[PDB]
Design a protein around this ligand. Structure first.
Ligand SMILES: *[C@@H]1O[C@H](CO)[C@@H](O[C@@H]2O[C@H](CO)[C@@H](O)[C@H](O)[C@H]2NC(C)=O)[C@H](O)[C@H]1NC(C)=O
Ligand SMILES: CCCCCCCCCC[C@@H](O)[C@@H](CCCCCC)C(=O)O
Length: 246
């Protein structure tokens, strides 16, 4: 299990949490020095439990699939909550079994469905450590519309930060003040599967992408990523989705 406490949190302690999160994900192989997530894991070992504490010390436990960093559901007091998707239902067979009741959320976990439920794209949802504190508090008491927005915050400040050093740094900059994610942040989130695939395809292609990946940079300009010498590959991406899962 990994843990993060919003009470007394700073860029340093958040950085430690993201390191812990990355380190809790198993790999037997690195591709271009980037850990390669496993094709599959059987049993309860497939799921990592993140213990998150809001400023007041109230807690949720979040279940994360270690093969893809997808949040499947969470526990809030004695109630478990899972996304409306087969992978999450499967997760409910292994985690939070001692919960008194189980609620299935009226949406899947994908960005498009969550944005519809929340009533706004994540371009317009501020993120940061204060937003994460809010998200935790929101998830403690069931409200499906509010929960959609909270989950959009949660996914980006945990899973996406684990996947990209740039996103981790973005959240560290937002330690005491929320701000909507940069277009670069959104771009990286959307391209994680694509980048993971192409980095793996580069293995037998002299470090060259079979298909170029289009990203928006920090300055806000659209750039093409064609090979492994790109800063996105050498410095940014921290975890690779296995091509068996793409
Ligand atoms: C591999 O990727 C790099 C980009 O990371 C490519 O180089 C850039 O491409 C041209 C010059 O060739 C310039 O417009 C850019 O300024 C370069 N960027 C950087 C950061 O140097 C390179 O062309 C690619 N190589 C192959 C074989 O595809
Ligand atoms: C893709 C259609 C159904 C969703 C399948 C699993 C995705 C939900 C699992 C958690 C998810 O929110 C991920 C990030 C979202 C990626 C989906 C956007 C298209 C996560 O928890 O980081």
């Amino acid at each position: 299990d990994v843990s993060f406490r919003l009470s007394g949190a700073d860029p340093s302690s958040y950085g430690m949490f993201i390191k812990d999160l990355r380190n809790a994900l198993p790999h037997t192989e690195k591709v271009y020095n980037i850990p390669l997530l496993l094709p599959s894991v059987s049993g309860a070992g497939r799921y990592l439990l993140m213990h998150l504490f809001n400023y007041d010390g109230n807690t949720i436990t979040v279940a994360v699939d270690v093969t893809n960093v997808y949040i499947m559901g969470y526990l809030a007091l004695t109630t478990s909550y899972f996304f409306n998707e087969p992978a999450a239902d499967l997760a409910s067979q292994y985690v939070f079994r001692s919960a008194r009741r189980k609620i299935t959320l009226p949406y899947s976990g994908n960005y498009e469905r969550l944005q519809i439920a929340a009533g706004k794209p994540r371009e317009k949802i501020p993120i940061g450590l204060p937003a994460l504190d809010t998200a935790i508090s929101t998830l403690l008491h069931y409200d499906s519309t509010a929960a959609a927005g909270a989950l959009l915050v949660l996914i980006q400040t945990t899973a996406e930060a684990a996947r990209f050093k740039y996103i981790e740094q973005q959240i560290q900059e937002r330690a005491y003040r929320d701000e909507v994610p940069s277009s670069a942040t959104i771009s990286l989130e959307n391209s994680w599967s694509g980048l993971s695939k192409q980095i793996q395809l580069a293995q037998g292609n002299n470090g060259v992408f079979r298909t170029p990946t289009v990203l928006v940079d920090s300055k806000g300009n659209r750039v093409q990523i064609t090979n492994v010498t790109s800063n996105v590959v050498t410095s940014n991406i921290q975890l690779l989705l296995n091509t068996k899962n793409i």
